[PDB]
Structure formats: structure tokens, C-alpha cells
């Protein structure tokens, strides 16, 4: 009964207004690119619309015709059609109304669930914040992976790069980072809440559905936006999805809040851009990518800033995901993005199969912020851990004397300490506890095949018996002398009792 009533509610409010609008005739349509004739006042990279309600962008302004790219399917556009200019640069909805919604590259709800109630729109192609608004990266972005929070820390406003081969665990790191923010978003203070945006570029719809259900299971869609431009979406959409998501995050960082955006991958945005550019007839470049392929990314990753307290104080972290071919980091797009981003997180298949998961290659992984953007407890402990692994990696290729034998023992203990599962990120204090136990010669007695058992049991024991100590470490944010003495006695007791 009420189904038809709510159906009518939609008609009751319509768009009566018909206006006198400028137009153009489609001289030629093919491969997703139209050549409109007319539109004498259409702007550059403006949004136009076709006779069937299908949108497009006027990318080329040639003297005789306008080269338009169609944001959708192309079979429905004929020759001699009509293109009406909307008189507005391409823009997307923004706001907290988008949280928990799966949307396409243009901000249209994709999961049903009604429409988006956004009250504001933002232009995708906006300039990055200047030099003055920013401020050095201060807070830590808690990722939940021990090896990332300890050895290659990420701040808020940094632009890490997750680069590896196919199926080494990049999207897994992204999902762990997204899921971990649940503890902060559930709390009270707004200075720690981090809203997450996941841009899925070129991934088949099944993968994005799996990801969305995984986030829902971990109850992580309360604060996550998913901008999906999947493989079957015309190239002009996969080219624009990163910019739409970055605008949705620019809103947060401009309104004093903190956001995290994860482009996944950028190596597929590059391919979509290449297809667009080749079908507009623009001359190719190296590996057929257009000349403006560095710009494409540099203008996009430069929007992940850390505003100073005069401009709200908000921040927007970025975690672009690149995909190399057989570890050839020396390729074109990988090198561009490596020279664009701050840090890197190298995942290697040789480490993935050797049992080290996440495969993070701590030897090559870097983070310019480093010291800054790390909690004091983690700063204290991960430093000694970093030195110990650095020494271990030198003498590792073989396998006598007591000193070097114990050095290898400690290195191996720490190595098996850094392993982890999927979608089970750890609180920072728990990571500190585990790493402290491992680095203070305690595990040197145990076998290295049992270190996982220890780690797990120790976590389960501490999370219940010694919740107070973990709360102390979190609140005070350092391993004070009394906290250190406690940690010492807890570890000494537990080790023997196991």
C-alpha cells in the first residue's frame, strides 16, 4: 500500500523548469569519445550532458569541435545527437552524508540504500593547498600492522606508497588500516577519529563486494566511504575516481577533521588515462602513456596535506597502491609515484612465500617522517628493534661464536614476532608490549617456531589480567620507569609459565 504512496512522493516533486540552454551536435561518436560541434561557450573540463541523460566531460577544445569523454556506456549516443552544456566544472557531492555509502566515481549511490543527502558539492580538479597552510606531520596514523607501526611509521598528512607485485598483501594492509580506526572512531575525542575513504579503481565488482562485506563484518562502514570505479566502468570514470575520492577527503581535512584515502590502484588510473588520451588522438609518450602522466598523479597526491591550526588543523593521509611487474620497481609509473610520495612499503613475493606476512621488506621500506609521528613508547622500543634487525640482516645469508650466534637468534626472534594475520590489527600499546617482550632478550630462550604461540597467548593474557597497564601505557603514552618494571615482571612470570 505505502509502497505506491512513496512512489508518488517522488513524482510530486519534479523539475518543471525548462531553460534555454546551449547545445551541440555529435559529429562523430566512437570508442567512448564524442566530437561535438557547437558548444561555443563550453569551458575546459566542464561537465556536459547527452540527450539520454548520460554525462560527459569536455576535455579537448579544438577550434572546430569539442572532444568529449562519456562517463558511461557509449552505445546509446548517435550521430547528430544533442549535447547540452551544464555550465559547471566536474564536481562531486561531499559531506558526512556519504559515510557508509558505496558510490561510483561521480558520487552516485551504488548499493541502493536510497540517495545521498549531500548538501555541498566540490570540484574534483582543485589545486593543492599552498606552502603556508600546511604544518609538519605530528600525530601518528595507527595502522595496526606491527611491522608498519614500528619500522616504517606513517603520520597524518603523510603520503605512504604500498608498492608490490600482484597478490602480496597490499589491499590487506589497506583493509587493516581501515579496520583499526574503529577503536578511535568509537571513542569520544574527535582529535583521533579518522574517516576512511577507499577508492577501488579497476577492481572487479566481486572484489569490491567482498571488501565491503568485510568492512561491514568488522563494523567499519560507520566511517568508510567506498568510491568504486570497477573494470566495467568506462575509462573516463576510472580516470576520475581518485579525484572524486580525494575531494571527498578534502572536505574532511578542510573542516578540521582527519581523513584517510586509499587509491587502489593508481597503476590502473594511469591505464585509464592512457586509453582516454589515445582515443582523443593526443600523441603517445613512453610506453604509450601520455606526456602528462606524472602530472596526473603529482597533482592528485599533493592534496594529502596536514593543515595547520589556523586552517582547522585537519589532515588527509593518502596510501596509494601501485603494482609492479615481477618486482620491476624501475618501471615508469612505479618510479613516478615513488618520486612523488613520502614513504614506501615494499612487499615482496620472496618474503610472502618464505612465511613473512605481511611481506613488508623492512630493509627497503622508508618513511621520511620517521621519528616524528610515532608514540613515545613505540619510539623507545622500535628503535632498538630497528638496530637489531639492521645488524641481523647483514649476517643472515648463512646459518658460530656466542656473540654472533645470539645476534642471529635475536634477529630471528624479532622476525617471527613481526608476523601477523588478516583483519586483526593491534592496539599500539599491545604492539609495544609484544615488541618489548621480544627485544628484551626474553624470547631468546624459546624456539623460533613457537614465537607465534607466545605472541598470541601473551596478548590474550595481558588483555584481561593487565588491562590496567595497557590503559596506563596508552594514556601516558610512554614506558615510564614503573611501567617498565611492571612489564618486566609480567613478562618474566609469563615466560616461565608457558
Amino acid at each position: 500500500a505505502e509502497v505506491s504512496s512513496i512512489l508518488e512522493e517522488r513524482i510530486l516533486g519534479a523539475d518543471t523548469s525548462v531553460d534555454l540552454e546551449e547545445t551541440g551536435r555529435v559529429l562523430s561518436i566512437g570508442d567512448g569519445i564524442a566530437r561535438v560541434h557547437g558548444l561555443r561557450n563550453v569551458q575546459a573540463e566542464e561537465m556536459v550532458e547527452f540527450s539520454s541523460g548520460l554525462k560527459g566531460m569536455s576535455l579537448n577544445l579544438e577550434p572546430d569541435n569539442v572532444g568529449v569523454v562519456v562517463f558511461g556506456n557509449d552505445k546509446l549516443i548517435k550521430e547528430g545527437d544533442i549535447v547540452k552544456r551544464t555550465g559547471a566544472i566536474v564536481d562531486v557531492p561531499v559531506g558526512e552524508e556519504l559515510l557508509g555509502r558505496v558510490v561510483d566515481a561521480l558520487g552516485n549511490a551504488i548499493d541502493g540504500k536510497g540517495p545521498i543527502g549531500s548538501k555541498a558539492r566540490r570540484r574534483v580538479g582543485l589545486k593543492a593547498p599552498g606552502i603556508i597552510p600546511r604544518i609538519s606531520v605530528r600525530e601518528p596514523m595507527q595502522t595496526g600492522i606491527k611491522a608498519v607501526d614500528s619500522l616504517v611509521p606513517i603520520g597524518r598528512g603523510q603520503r605512504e606508497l604500498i608498492i608490490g607485485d600482484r597478490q602480496t598483501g597490499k589491499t590487506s594492509i589497506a583493509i587493516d588500516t581501515i579496520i583499526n580506526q574503529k577503536r578511535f572512531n568509537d571513542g569520544t575525542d574527535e582529535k583521533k577519529k579518522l574517516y576512511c575513504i577507499y577508492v577501488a579503481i579497476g577492481q572487479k565488482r566481486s572484489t569490491v563486494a567482498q571488501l565491503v562485506k568485510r568492512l561491514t563484518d568488522a563494523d567499519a562502514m560507520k566511517y568508510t566511504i567506498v568510491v568504486s570505479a570497477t573494470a566495467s566502468d568506462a575509462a573516463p570514470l576510472q580516470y576520475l575516481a581518485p579525484y572524486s575520492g580525494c575531494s571527498m577527503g578534502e572536505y574532511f581535512r578542510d573542516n578540521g577533521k582527519h581523513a584517510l584515502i586509499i587509491y587502489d590502484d593508481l597503476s590502473k588510473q594511469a591505464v585509464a588515462y592512457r586509453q582516454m588520451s589515445l582515443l582523443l588522438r593526443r600523441p603517445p609518450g613512453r610506453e604509450a602513456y601520455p606526456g602528462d602522466v606524472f602530472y596526473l598523479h603529482s597533482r592528485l597526491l599533493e592534496r594529502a596535506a596536514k593543515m595547520n591550526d589556523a586552517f582547522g588543523g585537519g589532515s588527509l593521509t593518502a596510501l596509494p597502491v601501485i603494482e609492479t611487474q615481477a618486482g620491476d620497481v624501475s618501471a615508469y609509473i612505479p618510479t613516478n609515484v615513488i618520486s612523488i610520495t613520502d614513504g614506501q612499503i615494499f612487499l615482496e613475493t620472496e618474503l610472502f612465500y618464505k612465511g613473512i606476512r605481511p611481506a613488508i621488506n623492512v630493509g627497503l621500506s622508508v618513511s621520511r617522517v620517521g621519528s616524528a609521528a610515532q608514540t613515545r613508547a613505540m619510539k623507545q622500543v622500535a628503535g632498538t628493534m630497528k638496530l637489531e634487525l639492521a645488524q641481523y640482516r647483514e649476517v643472515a645469508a648463512f646459518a658460530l661464536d656466542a656473540a654472533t650466534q645470539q645476534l642471529l637468534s635475536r634477529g630471528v626472534r624479532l622476525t617471527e614476532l613481526l608476523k601477523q594475520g588478516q583483519y586483526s590489527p593491534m592496539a599500539i600499546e599491545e604492539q609495544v608490549a609484544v615488541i618489548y617482550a621480544g627485544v628484551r632478550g626474553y624470547l631468546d630462550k624459546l624456539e623460533p617456531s613457537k614465537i607465534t604461540k607466545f605472541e598470541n597467548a601473551f596478548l590474550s593474557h595481558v588483555i584481561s589480567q593487565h588491562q590496567a597497564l595497557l590503559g596506563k601505557i596508552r594514556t601516558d603514552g610512554k614506558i615510564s620507569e614503573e611501567s617498565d618494571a611492571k612489564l618486566k615482571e609480567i613478562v618474566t612470570n609469563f615466560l616461565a609459565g608457558f
Binding site: 590474550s460 589480567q465 609459565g497
Partner: protein, 51 residues
């Protein structure tokens, strides 16, 4: 409801005759698994929005 008497383990391991360690270790492991399970389960069953 729950208030479990604390234990000392290095102390506990001192009181097992060699003929009885094979059951002591198994009991330790079974305790471990059950404690992990209990930690896994939440403090309460979540509410229901009947209205």
C-alpha cells in the same frame, strides 16, 4: 558472575611428578584454549531493536 582465582605457573609446574606431567601439560593447553575462547566472546549479548 566471573572472578577467577589467580595462579602462579612456575610455582604450579613444581608440583607434578614425572609420571603426571603428560596430563599437566594437556590441562595447561586446554586452559589456554578455553581462556582464549572466553576472551573472544563479548561481555554481553548485544541488544535488540524491537521497536
Amino acid at each position: 558472575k566471573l572472578a577467577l582465582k589467580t595462579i602462579d605457573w612456575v610455582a604450579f609446574g613444581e608440583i607434578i611428578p614425572r609420571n603426571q606431567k603428560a596430563v599437566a601439560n594437556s590441562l595447561k593447553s586446554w586452559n589456554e584454549t578455553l581462556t582464549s575462547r572466553l576472551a573472544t566472546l563479548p561481555e554481553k549479548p548485544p541488544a535488540i531493536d524491537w521497536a
